[PDB]
Design a protein around this motif. Structure first.
Motif, PDB file in Angstrom:
ATOM      1  N   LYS A   1     -13.325  60.943  28.154  1.00 38.80           N
ATOM      2  CA  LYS A   1     -13.135  59.765  27.282  1.00 38.80           C
ATOM      3  C   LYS A   1     -11.670  59.575  26.944  1.00 38.80           C
ATOM      4  O   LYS A   1     -11.457  60.225  26.105  1.00 38.80           O
ATOM      5  CB  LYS A   1     -13.978  59.570  26.344  1.00 38.80           C
ATOM      6  N   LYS A   2     -11.124  58.408  27.290  1.00 39.33           N
ATOM      7  CA  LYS A   2      -9.792  57.981  26.589  1.00 39.33           C
ATOM      8  C   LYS A   2      -9.913  57.832  25.199  1.00 39.33           C
ATOM      9  O   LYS A   2     -10.896  57.618  24.480  1.00 39.33           O
ATOM     10  CB  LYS A   2      -9.246  56.622  27.462  1.00 39.33           C
ATOM     11  N   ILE A   3      -8.800  58.612  24.530  1.00 41.28           N
ATOM     12  CA  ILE A   3      -8.545  58.501  23.182  1.00 41.28           C
ATOM     13  C   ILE A   3      -7.437  57.573  22.891  1.00 41.28           C
ATOM     14  O   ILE A   3      -6.327  58.026  23.399  1.00 41.28           O
ATOM     15  CB  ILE A   3      -8.435  59.856  22.458  1.00 41.28           C
ATOM     16  N   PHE A   4      -7.533  56.288  21.966  1.00 39.85           N
ATOM     17  CA  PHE A   4      -6.650  55.630  21.988  1.00 39.85           C
ATOM     18  C   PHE A   4      -5.993  55.548  20.576  1.00 39.85           C
ATOM     19  O   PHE A   4      -6.887  55.159  19.773  1.00 39.85           O
ATOM     20  CB  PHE A   4      -7.102  53.862  22.244  1.00 39.85           C
ATOM     21  N   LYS A   5      -4.679  55.945  20.452  1.00 36.82           N
ATOM     22  CA  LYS A   5      -4.318  55.786  19.007  1.00 36.82           C
ATOM     23  C   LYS A   5      -4.280  54.209  18.833  1.00 36.82           C
ATOM     24  O   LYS A   5      -3.701  53.742  19.340  1.00 36.82           O
ATOM     25  CB  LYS A   5      -2.844  56.532  19.042  1.00 36.82           C
ATOM     26  N   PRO A   6      -4.399  53.901  17.521  1.00 35.42           N
ATOM     27  CA  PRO A   6      -3.996  52.580  17.033  1.00 35.42           C
ATOM     28  C   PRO A   6      -2.513  51.852  17.400  1.00 35.42           C
ATOM     29  O   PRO A   6      -2.595  51.030  17.947  1.00 35.42           O
ATOM     30  CB  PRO A   6      -4.128  52.549  15.517  1.00 35.42           C
ATOM     31  N   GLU A   7      -1.723  53.010  17.347  1.00 33.83           N
ATOM     32  CA  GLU A   7      -0.236  52.406  17.625  1.00 33.83           C
ATOM     33  C   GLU A   7      -0.004  52.156  19.032  1.00 33.83           C
ATOM     34  O   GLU A   7       0.608  51.260  19.449  1.00 33.83           O
ATOM     35  CB  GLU A   7       0.693  53.628  17.042  1.00 33.83           C
ATOM     36  N   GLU A   8      -0.918  52.902  20.036  1.00 34.26           N
ATOM     37  CA  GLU A   8      -0.773  52.755  21.208  1.00 34.26           C
ATOM     38  C   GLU A   8      -1.521  51.358  21.746  1.00 34.26           C
ATOM     39  O   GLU A   8      -0.923  50.434  22.412  1.00 34.26           O
ATOM     40  CB  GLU A   8      -1.629  53.840  22.185  1.00 34.26           C
TER      41      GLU A   8
ATOM     42  N   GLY B   1      -4.838  48.757  12.850  1.00 33.28           N
ATOM     43  CA  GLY B   1      -5.450  49.768  13.629  1.00 33.28           C
ATOM     44  C   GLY B   1      -7.202  49.750  13.552  1.00 33.28           C
ATOM     45  O   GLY B   1      -7.584  50.843  13.245  1.00 33.28           O
ATOM     46  N   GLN B   2      -7.609  48.623  13.632  1.00 34.75           N
ATOM     47  CA  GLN B   2      -9.092  48.419  13.358  1.00 34.75           C
ATOM     48  C   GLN B   2      -9.930  48.630  14.903  1.00 34.75           C
ATOM     49  O   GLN B   2     -11.153  48.308  14.662  1.00 34.75           O
ATOM     50  CB  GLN B   2      -9.476  47.063  12.491  1.00 34.75           C
ATOM     51  N   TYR B   3      -9.311  48.348  15.930  1.00 34.03           N
ATOM     52  CA  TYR B   3     -10.024  48.673  17.244  1.00 34.03           C
ATOM     53  C   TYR B   3     -10.148  50.267  17.543  1.00 34.03           C
ATOM     54  O   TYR B   3      -8.951  50.823  17.755  1.00 34.03           O
ATOM     55  CB  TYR B   3      -9.140  47.728  18.151  1.00 34.03           C
ATOM     56  N   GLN B   4     -11.463  50.539  17.987  1.00 32.32           N
ATOM     57  CA  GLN B   4     -11.476  51.815  18.453  1.00 32.32           C
ATOM     58  C   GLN B   4     -11.053  51.993  20.054  1.00 32.32           C
ATOM     59  O   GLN B   4     -10.575  52.909  20.250  1.00 32.32           O
ATOM     60  CB  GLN B   4     -12.894  52.384  18.266  1.00 32.32           C
ATOM     61  N   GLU B   5     -11.254  50.806  20.804  1.00 39.53           N
ATOM     62  CA  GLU B   5     -10.765  50.927  22.116  1.00 39.53           C
ATOM     63  C   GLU B   5     -10.347  49.438  22.600  1.00 39.53           C
ATOM     64  O   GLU B   5     -10.949  48.515  22.087  1.00 39.53           O
ATOM     65  CB  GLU B   5     -12.027  51.438  23.051  1.00 39.53           C
TER      66      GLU B   5
END
Ligand SMILES: Cc1cc(N2CCOCC2)cc2[nH]c(-c3c(NC[C@@H](O)c4cccc(Cl)c4)cc[nH]c3=O)nc12
Length: 116
Positions: free
Chosen positions: A1-8, A64-68
């Motif tokens: 599973k991809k982990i997405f940093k808010p900044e990305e 930064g409120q989106y998980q993915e």
């Protein structure tokens, strides 16, 4: 599973959001939450159950409120679908929405591919 940093998600998706905002006059009805009283359309929430607009989408991306990233895609299409539901198919705001949606479908594809 991809982990997405808010900044990305912020840096990758912000240009697609700017592409919607920069459409003038087409983006103006979408820049702030629909205000039914001010716009004189008091049955708006009778028809649109889940409102969404650019300022809300922008705040979620900026803070930064989106998980993915597909949740961002979800919010953008919810905003368009609201406008396509409320407004008649040949009306100005329906056409405005279709213009923003054309821009988005084009911009979002290569960005989502690079995010993986
Ligand atoms: C492209 C398009 C055109 C139109 N109409 C054109 C003709 O005039 C009337 C409006 C309505 C649309 N509704 C949706 C839509 C979604 N799309 C994902 C797509 O962006 C997408 C899909 C896979 C990968 C990526 Cl990267 C992006 C997702 C959830 N719910 C949706 O409703 N896409 C529409």
């Amino acid at each position: 599973k991809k982990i997405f940093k808010p900044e990305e998600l912020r840096q990758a998706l912000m240009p697609t959001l700017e592409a919607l905002y920069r459409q003038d006059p087409e983006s103006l009805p979408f820049r702030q939450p629909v205000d039914p009283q001010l716009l004189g359309i008091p049955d708006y929430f009778d028809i649109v159950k889940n409102p969404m607009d650019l300022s809300t989408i922008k705040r979620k991306l900026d803070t930064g409120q989106y998980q993915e990233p597909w949740q961002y895609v979800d919010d953008v299409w919810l905003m368009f679908n609201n406008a396509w539901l409320y407004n008649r198919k040949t009306s100005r705001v329906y056409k405005f929405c279709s213009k923003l949606a054309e821009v988005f479908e084009q911009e979002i594809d290569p960005v989502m591919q690079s995010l993986g």
